[PDB]
A paper describes a structure:
Carboxysomes are anabolic BMCs for autotrophic CO2 fixation found in all cyanobacteria and many proteobacteria. The carboxysome is composed of a polyhedral shell that encapsulates the key CO2-fixation enzyme, ribulose-1,5-bisphosphate carboxylase/oxygenase (Rubisco), and carbonic anhydrase (CA), which dehydrates HCO3− to CO2, the substrate for Rubisco carboxylation. In α-carboxysomes, the disordered linker protein CsoS2 plays an essential role in carboxysome assembly and Rubisco encapsulation.
The high-quality map of the T = 9 shell (1.86 Å resolution) allows for accurate modelling of CsoS2-C that tightly associates with shell proteins, resulting in an atomic model of the T = 9 shell comprising 80 CsoS1A hexamers, 12 CsoS4A pentamers and 60 CsoS2-C. Of those, interfaces 3 and 4 are unique to the T = 9 shell, whereas interfaces 1 and 2 are present in all three shells as previously reported. In contrast, the angles between two hexamers in interfaces 3 and 4 are arranged in a planar fashion, markedly different from those in interfaces 1 and 2, and also different from those measured in other BMC mini-shells. The cryoEM structure of the T = 9 shell at 1.86 Å resolution enables the characterization of CsoS2 and its interactions with the shell at atomic details. It is clearly well-resolved for the most of C-terminus in the cryoEM map, allowing unambiguous assignment of amino acid residues of three fragments of CsoS2-C: F1, Arg712−Arg731; F2, Leu773−Gly823; F3, Glu829−Gly869. The cryoEM structure revealed that the F1, F2, F3 fragments adopt completely different conformations from the AlphaFold2-predicted structures. Interestingly, all three CsoS2-C fragments, F1 to F3, bind specifically to the tri-capsomere interfaces. While CsoS2-F1 and F2 interact with three CsoS1A hexamers, CsoS2-F3 acts on the interface between one CsoS4A pentamer and two CsoS1A hexamers, with the extreme C-terminus buried inside the cavity formed by the interface. The three CsoS2-C F1-F3 fragments associate tightly with shell proteins simultaneously and essentially “stitches” the capsomeres together at the inner surface of the T = 9 shell. However, a close inspection of the interfaces uncovers a common interaction motif among these interactions: alignment of all the CsoS1A-CsoS2 interfaces identifies a repetitive Ile(Val)-Thr-Gly ([IV]TG) motif that interacts with the β-strand of highly conserved CsoS1A through His79 and hydrogen bonds in the main chain.
Numbering used by the authors:
A (entry chain E), B (entry chain D), C (entry chain F), D (entry chain C), E (entry chain A), F (entry chain B), ...: 6 to 97
I (entry chain X): 712 to 731, 773 to 823, 829 to 869
J (entry chain G): 1 to 81
Write the structure that this text describes.
Amino acid sequence: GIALGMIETRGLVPAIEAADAMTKAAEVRLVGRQFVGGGYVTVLVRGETGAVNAAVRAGADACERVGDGLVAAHIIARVHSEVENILPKAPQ
Amino acid sequence: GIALGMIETRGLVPAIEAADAMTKAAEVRLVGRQFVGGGYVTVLVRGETGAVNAAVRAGADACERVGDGLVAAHIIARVHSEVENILPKAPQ
Amino acid sequence: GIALGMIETRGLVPAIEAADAMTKAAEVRLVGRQFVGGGYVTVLVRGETGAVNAAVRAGADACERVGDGLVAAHIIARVHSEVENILPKAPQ
Amino acid sequence: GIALGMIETRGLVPAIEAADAMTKAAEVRLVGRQFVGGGYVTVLVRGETGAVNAAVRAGADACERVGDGLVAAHIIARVHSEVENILPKAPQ
Amino acid sequence: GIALGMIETRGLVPAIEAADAMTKAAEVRLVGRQFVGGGYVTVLVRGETGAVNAAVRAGADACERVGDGLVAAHIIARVHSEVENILPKAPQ
Amino acid sequence: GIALGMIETRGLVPAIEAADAMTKAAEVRLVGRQFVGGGYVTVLVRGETGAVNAAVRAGADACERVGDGLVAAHIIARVHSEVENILPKAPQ
Amino acid sequence: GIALGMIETRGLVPAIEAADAMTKAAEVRLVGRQFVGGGYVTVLVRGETGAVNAAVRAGADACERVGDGLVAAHIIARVHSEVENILPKAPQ
Amino acid sequence: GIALGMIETRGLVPAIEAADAMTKAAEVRLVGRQFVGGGYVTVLVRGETGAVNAAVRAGADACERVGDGLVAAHIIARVHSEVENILPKAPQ
Amino acid sequence: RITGPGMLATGLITGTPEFRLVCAPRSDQMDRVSGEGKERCHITGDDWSVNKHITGTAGQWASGRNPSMRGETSAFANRNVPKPEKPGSKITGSSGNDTQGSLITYSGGARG
Amino acid sequence: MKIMQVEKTLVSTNRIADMGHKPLLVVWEKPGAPRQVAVDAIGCIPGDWVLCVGSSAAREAAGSKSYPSDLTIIGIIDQWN
């Protein structure tokens, strides 16, 4: 799938919990963890649109009560080709 | 076109939503995503004045309720050649 | 070390105290000290499940009262195989 | 040609708007755009004292109402030679 | 000596004052100065237990009312061998 | 000149103004400008004790009204040789 | 069809009604009807995540009032690969 | 590992959910699902003692409110070889 | 009473042995997941929404897996830091001495 | 209104305080035409073809009913030769 799901958190620990829950919940792959600055961490997943929806929902529910919690949960079913250049392809 | 559209958001998720909306709404090229610091994220587009106007309006509408939300949605019809030295040409 | 232990502190001194407490408590290997940004610091330990459990409890108790204090203490007994690509192997 | 003008903003978008307005107002060279940290951005211009004066006034007026706004609009007509060491010579 | 003394401050100025006080008070060596991010600055000293105790007490006393003040003043008489990987050996 | 004068400000513009005022007021060498993080910027000068006293007073007075203002004004009259490892010798 | 939909009923008649509603509502394949013992009957479907969601919703609604009623309506977007060893591929 | 974790449920759906939760929670392997009779369903996992404790806790919490719920959650840290004769080795 | 460095910083040191409409209104409806995951608009038919009596995937089945224990300095947070009185201009003659626009400072904090 | 091309910037340090911080640009209808100075309310670059309103409308275009301007740039032409 080509849909994109993202979770923004306050701190790395909720971000890692969100990534774990997202990958365990549905058929999605982790494509990047980004340190935004000022304490924000963003985790990104790709997959089928319904799988992405389930994964992001589970990640939000899992990371809400972890650390300083959840900032954003968002799904884009088909990202523009231009936006593909600001998205990490593989996690590192 | 040499017009510049800029959207500043709190966090990367609303910035990505804004970039997606801007690139879907008009013929503009995403030239940069900048981590300003303190959580500020800026997405910049270039194109014709009408296209940049439409793109910035659509992105500002789209990202206003995503995560911690929008900070600035600005348009410059003609960029001075001096400012071209501090503007990214391609994103990453 | 399959289990993952994670402690996030406000500042570096509670992170160092927590890492010392975890590594003294049980057989865990410290795999990362990440400067998240905005003052957040995360210490990550791997090990067997019971060792990581004991280490995380000890580290949370130790770094409770040091500096600006505790933010999060988290245990993941087995992260998803995707999550391993955003986890550090060794400290830098 | 040796006067220094400085505008500090909260966020990159007001800083870019201020630099654009400054270089449009008078004959000033944009010598630096600094990401201070925590969201502060500083744009620095060099030129004749009158040109720097007009440019800084126009830039402050233009960037006051953009994003999170303006922090500082400062003119140094005669820079001490020691301060030149910490001043940027070209942007990036 | 292998004991560890750490002082965390808000801003560089109290950290430098604390380092001066620590190295004046006792026979400790300054091994690091870390910019944690978010304004936090940590200075680390090594020495024998009594030297580290005296140095940390003196630094905390000296930097308490300097700038934005003191965050942490901590002593670890013997850090675990794992924690050595995340401790600077020399400053820069 | 062995004495050390430091001024910490919120934002770069007051720091540059403080450095200019300090170097104009008395015979002091500007040795560093540090981006602490979180918006803190520290400027360091070296010189004789009286020169450093005058310089720090002039810098604080000149930069208190600029931008987000002044955080700290500190003098160390006799810096320990250990502290010179973390003090910049030439500014960047 | 990665996702898994499960409906447990008391008796076979509500299970058959639930299976009919599930397969009519969305593109899901019925991969098993299991006589659990003691009167429990489980119907299991596979498909896309959104299709499975709609199917399970419809099946629960349909079989709620039939016979001795519904016991459980459960969805797993992606089971663990080991769990596939206890999941029927075809209904025998 | 050689420890044995068992979950007994009323119905098949909570048993499948428990098996999924146990496998996803910790480093354990699913070895069997047994229909007992009268509606009882038992899922068994094998692994290291700490991993088994974590997996059984997670599965018991997950299946508690699914269908007719949970009957028993038991951990045997070391299984006698005589009992291995009545234990499935591979799930079917 | 023994004097020296041991009497300093009492109550500050740690680590010592002693220490040890179809769509709901935009204003008052914040979505769980924004964008394509929005539930604001009432979609009829066979959508991917989940009923109340349906279990799994999200909810406690994602948050109960991993045990967890809970425990600003920036440009934005500094917009209301106390500042001294704004500098005034007492100069005369025509020098572009606008007093209504934004604050412009010259060397030493003078108004300009 | 008129169509004029921006030539260069104009700086007057000793200008009256009522002008505020607004920048001034030198405009002419074509190269070689008589030069005029407009208040730049848009932020244009040299070479831009702009729209300049005069008379009493220029005052409000520059910001207030009492602004000392009789020529203000109020737009940049999207495409002009």
